[PDB]
Write a protein that binds this ligand. Sequence first.
Ligand SMILES: Nc1ncnc2c1ncn2[C@@H]1O[C@H](COP(=O)(O)OP(=O)(O)O)[C@@H](O)[C@H]1O
Ligand SMILES: [Mg+2]
Length: 379
Amino acid sequence: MNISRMNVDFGNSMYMNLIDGYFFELPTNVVEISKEAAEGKFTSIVEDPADLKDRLLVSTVIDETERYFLVGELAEPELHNKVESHIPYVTFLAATAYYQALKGKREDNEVTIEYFQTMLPIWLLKKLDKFSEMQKRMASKFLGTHQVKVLTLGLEKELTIKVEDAACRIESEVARWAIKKNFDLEDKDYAEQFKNYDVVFCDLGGGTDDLVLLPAGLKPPKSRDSFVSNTAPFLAHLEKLRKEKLLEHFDSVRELEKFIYSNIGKTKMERRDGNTGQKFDLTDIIKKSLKEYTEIKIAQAENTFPAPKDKVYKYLYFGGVGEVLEESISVVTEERYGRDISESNHIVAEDARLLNLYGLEVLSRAEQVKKQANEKEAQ
Ligand SMILES: Nc1ncnc2c1ncn2[C@@H]1O[C@H](COP(=O)(O)OP(=O)(O)O)[C@@H](O)[C@H]1O
Ligand SMILES: [Mg+2]
């Protein structure tokens, strides 16, 4: 099987990837188990490749040792350095094997990837004096030939995966390409509102909040000071909310997190007991808590890059939390700056959760065009 473009967002909450324009995502969990635990782990055969996604049991050889991993939703009932940790690498292998099983032939045991692309979080890059070298090591982790075994009964095989070319971009910053261009590499009219304003890109996530200062026209950051990461996370805010106000309704922060993004955006946020179908309106409690958090976010962003009083900044909010907070952001910015500045200067991205990934996708299409241009000039 041949893959032209593969773009990966190793999130803290979800692994997400686009493979030749095809989207799917997996829970980030990777649990390492022993050989005997993996045997007699999985009991009944599966035949439909789609079922593999929730049943990812793989092995791969690491430092000449064959090790066994539960990946994604199968790892569920059981901030890492993205470069030196095996977790992203193992997730990538399982993801690729899943896509092969879903879209490819049973007897095809080989996958070639022309162009692999991922990225690194700002909090990790800022620890080093040079971003480029860490990004190069990240890319090198995926370049070349790898093998993985699928041990899920019914879909067993050892897959050889060959990555011909690989690159690593900067999270949050790279998302600007999803605003600048569409996948046909046309300039977006949507980006014109940022033609004359420096923009603070606010990547609001579950575990970090990363901000990039983009000079007018969504141009590259001027220096290292234009990249900032914060850690007083959204998940801690939810788990404090759960233990204080909602202990009755959620036994884990993951449950509360799932209920919120599933239910934010409608007028009533209703919790549904499965046994008796009884109803609990949790709307007031939740929007109130989200507004609190948003007030902290707006203030952080405002204070992160001290806008000089002869400059007007605009703010573009994204990430999965940005998506959830969209309503809250509109309310809070209107209270704080007035309606006019709220609407024109505080923008929540559409596809906020997927913007980084989409930025990779745009770069991979430009790269793909560049390649074909180069190869035809080669005569
Ligand atoms: N459809 C969705 N699936 C999963 N999470 C979502 C979804 N929509 C919004 N979210 C929110 O996205 C957050 C994860 O944000 P993300 O940008 O992935 O940051 P991180 O990678 O740090 O978790 C979750 O806390 C969740 O509340
Ligand atoms: Mg992210």
